[PDB]
Design a protein around this nucleic acid. Structure first.
Ligand SMILES: Nc1ncnc2c1ncn2[C@@H]1OC[C@H](OP(=O)(O)OP(=O)(O)OP(=O)(O)O)[C@H]1O
Ligand SMILES: [Cl-]
Ligand SMILES: [Mg+2]
Length: 750
DNA sequence: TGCACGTACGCAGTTCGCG
DNA sequence: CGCGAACTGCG
């Protein structure tokens, strides 16, 4: 099984290293035969003699073209002649590629920014995480104090906990009387003892929770401060903190640092992504949290450290347990894209698609299009196109509602109509499909590039859903639900990639064709079910709609909808198909993207309401839920009013826990780049001045204090909140949090 | 190491600025 | 003192 690749330099020449686990043994393979290269499109073949003359420099040594070879390839499925330009070292490519492109005889250059080690995985056709090998995993976490004004790594690590299949232990240099705590003398010994533990256990995988920016980065930053040779790599090297543009990431040669945090970010949508919140969401059990205030007190007083040692142990314990569940799903994703788990587990979804596209392109001798420069990137960001069809919903309460939904609409459209950049307005074909409204044409004589890849993803999603019905255990069902959602996000990201300004295979024409087809399919389907079947469509969005036969009983609507399904599915071509997605007794639709229905089991599912949205306090989420209960279940408009007025009286008497009072909101950019400053940004700008690092992705949890003026002026983070000292704004939570969400359900006056 | 900068659109709703 | 911009996050 391939674990990762990198390269080292030997006698000025690159040497690929292939880290593998084969038959339960770690191994490094060496390849000194791979030459860095990129392509050049020349106006005339005779110019190759001038192109060979172009030189450049890096750190004193001159960079030359080592060798050239004229190859025949395809660009968007059309034959093209280009020159393969070879070079001695990978670092030569960034130094000379610009000067090579600007030559007047060079039309363009291609595939000039592929990292050497990942270029190797594609060209030689290796797939990481392939094969039947069991990987050993070891989680760890550190406990570290931080005063107001302390810099990075200036504080000592108090505790280093770790966990695997054999249990969990804590290492510390203060005496704690616990059978899973090993008390050493100093911090250096504790760090050295941890180094010995990992070398002894020799895990293939090191699991952390946001260790890229905290635990692993701190531990290494401390090892440089005390002068500890933290030889963690299996090649005898130290963990290396890697600059990843805005963020940093920790790599350990020969192992795999699995940082669960970025994985969890793009799998589960949570209000906050603390280790405690993630554990409860995944395993359905709560996890107590010990805050830096109690760790500072227990460290200073010397009492209650057993409570802290327990917290530290559980950090590593739940990190192993979470890592145990999410590593195989990330491994399968690594197998598809054909890139190492270390990279795949930290990549954006757009990057995963492109790397897979790059591999597939090489497989078919297709020259890759280049990423856009700064100007073309700005142009694509400025252009857009029409999206999903949305219908203003029918107001009032409706009964016997059926929800009909298209199955993987956008991928189905891409496959069925062969929407791809190599098929768009392609001349010389005998059959075309014409995109409605926009009029783009797509060749159908051969499977298009992206359409030829989407089928397997859809089949992979249905197989997981098949297992979901055969799943008895509720935990395996939840994890399967995660997996099929990740595939659905990935498959639909192929459509979105077409509109991604940074995409190599950018295709605005493809993206607006998919939506146009999606609009025509859902709109004509609505017309058909209404005019031919007497249904009344209550609410419709991009690929699905709610409908009913007004006045007909539950069974009648239920069977006419099934009859309608067979009727249009025989009319729809290719992979397009409507699904019977669910039946609901009653329901109503407040506005676009906001609704709530109740099923035959009296379970109330909602869409787009404040119940699921981040930014609304829990007492606001709770009050809307109970009002929806009194409406959709009991049908008591007056009961919901009594719930609201009673909750508002709880707020005025300060009878509410400040826990139900927290507002969560995320930063989406650099704090210096915010034009306007909202409450979560005003708070975030404060913690930025207090030393707490805030970056795109940080979730602020604040409470609004009693005052008059801007909300951001009286906002305070939940950490520093003291219920005895601080008094929240009772009027704000009544009038701005609790009341508007329930008011907007104004079927009756209020 | 020299890659990543985070798949798309349509839209409800809040804070804030300022007239 | 109503509204437009800035912003977040839903489906
Ligand atoms: N994150 C997304 N990015 C781009 N397009 C998307 C996304 N989510 C949905 N779409 C597209 O928007 C329309 C449609 O929404 P469904 O949420 O219904 O996802 P399927 O339809 O794919 O699959 P199912 O019905 O669950 O089998 C989907 O094609
Ligand atoms: Cl060799
Ligand atoms: Mg669908």
């Amino acid at each position: 099984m391939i674990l990762d690749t990198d390269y080292i330099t030997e006698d000025g020449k690159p040497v690929i290293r292939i880290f593998k686990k084969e038959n339960g043994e770690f191994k490094i393979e060496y390849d000194r035969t791979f030459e860095p290269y990129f392509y050049a499109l020349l106006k005339d073949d005779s110019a190759i003699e001038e192109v060979k003359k172009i030189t450049a420099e890096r750190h004193g040594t001159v960079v030359t073209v080592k060798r050239v070879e004229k190859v025949q390839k395809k660009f968007l499925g059309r034959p093209v002649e280009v020159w393969k330009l070879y070079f001695t070292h990978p670092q030569d490519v960034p130094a000379i590629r610009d000067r090579i492109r600007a030559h007047p005889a060079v039309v363009d250059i291609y595939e000039y920014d592929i990292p050497f080690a990942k270029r190797y995985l594609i060209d030689k056709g290796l797939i990481p995480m392939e094969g039947d090998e069991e990987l050993t995993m070891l989680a760890f976490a550190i406990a570290t104090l931080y005063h107001e004004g302390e810099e990075f790594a200036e504080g000592p690590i108090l505790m280093i906990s770790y966990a695997d299949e054999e249990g969990a232990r804590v290492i510390t240099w203060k005496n704690v009387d616990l059978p899973y705590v090993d008390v050493v003398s100093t911090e250096r010994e504790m760090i050295k003892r941890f180094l010995r533990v990992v070398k002894e256990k020799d895990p293939d995988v090191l699991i952390t929770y946001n260790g890229d920016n905290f635990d692993f980065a701190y531990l290494k930053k401390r090892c440089e401060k005390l002068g500890i040779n933290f030889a963690l790599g299996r090649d005898g090297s130290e963990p290396k903190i890697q600059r990843m543009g805005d963020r940093f990431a920790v790599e350990v040669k020969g192992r795999i640092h699995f940082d669960l945090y970025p994985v969890i970010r793009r799998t589960i949508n949570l209000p906050t992504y603390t280790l405690e919140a993630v554990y409860e969401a995944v395993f359905g059990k709560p996890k107590e949290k010990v805050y830096a205030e109690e760790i500072a007190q227990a460290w200073e007083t010397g009492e209650g450290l057993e409570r802290v040692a327990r917290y530290s142990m559980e950090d590593a314990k739940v990190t192993y347990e979470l890592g145990k569940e999410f590593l195989p799903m990330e491994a399968q994703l690594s197998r598809l894209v054909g890139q190492p788990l270390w990279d795949v587990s930290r990549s954006s979804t757009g990057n995963l698609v492109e790397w897979y596209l790059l591999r597939k392109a090489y497989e078919r001798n297709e020259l890759a299009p280049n990423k856009p420069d700064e100007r073309e990137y700005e142009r694509r960001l400025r252009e857009s196109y029409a999206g999903g069809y949305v219908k203003e919903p029918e107001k009032g309460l409706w009964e016997n509602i059926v929800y009909l939904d298209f199955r993987s609409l956008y991928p189905s459209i891409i496959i069925t109509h062969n929407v791809s950049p190599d098929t768009l307005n392609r001349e010389g074909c005998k059959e075309y499909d014409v995109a409605p409204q926009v009029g783009h044409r797509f060749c159908k004589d051969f499977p298009g590039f992206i359409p030829s890849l989407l089928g397997d993803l859809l089949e992979e999603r249905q197989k997981i859903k098949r297992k979901m019905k055969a799943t008895v255990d509720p935990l395996e069902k939840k994890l399967l639900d995660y997996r099929q959602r990740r595939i659905k996000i990935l498959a639909s990201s192929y459509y979105g990639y077409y509109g991604y300004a940074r995409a190599r295979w950018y295709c605005k024409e493809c993206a607006e064709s998919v939506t146009a087809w999606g609009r025509q399919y859902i709109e004509t389907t609505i017309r058909e079910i209404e005019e031919k079947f007497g249904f009344k469509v209550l609410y419709a969005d991009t690929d699905g709609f709610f409908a009913t036969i007004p006045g007909a009983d539950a069974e009648t609507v239920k069977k006419k909808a099934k009859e309608f399904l067979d009727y249009i599915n025989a009319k729809l071509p290719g992979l397009l198909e409507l699904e019977y997605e669910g039946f609901y007794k009653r329901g109503f639709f407040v506005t676009k993207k906001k609704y709530a229905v109740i099923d035959e089991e009296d379970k109330i599912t909602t869409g787009g309401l404040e119940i699921v949205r981040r930014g609304w306090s829990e007492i606001a989420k709770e009050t809307q839920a109970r009002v929806l209960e009194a409406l959709l279940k009991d049908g008591d408009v007056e009961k919901a009013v009594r719930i609201v007025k009673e909750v508002t009286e709880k707020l005025s008497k300060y009878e509410v826990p400040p826990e139900k009072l927290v507002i969560h909101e995320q930063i989406t950019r650099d704090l210096r780049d915010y034009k306007a400053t909202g409450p979560h940004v005003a708070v975030a700008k404060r913690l930025a001045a207090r030393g707490v690092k805030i970056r795109p992705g940080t979730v602020i949890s604040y409470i609004v204090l009693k005052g008059s003026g801007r909300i951001g002026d009286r906002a305070i983070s939940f950490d520093e909140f003291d219920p005895a000292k601080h008094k929240y704004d009772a009027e704000y939570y009544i009038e701005n949090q609790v009341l508007p969400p329930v008011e907007r359900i104004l079927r009756a006056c209020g």
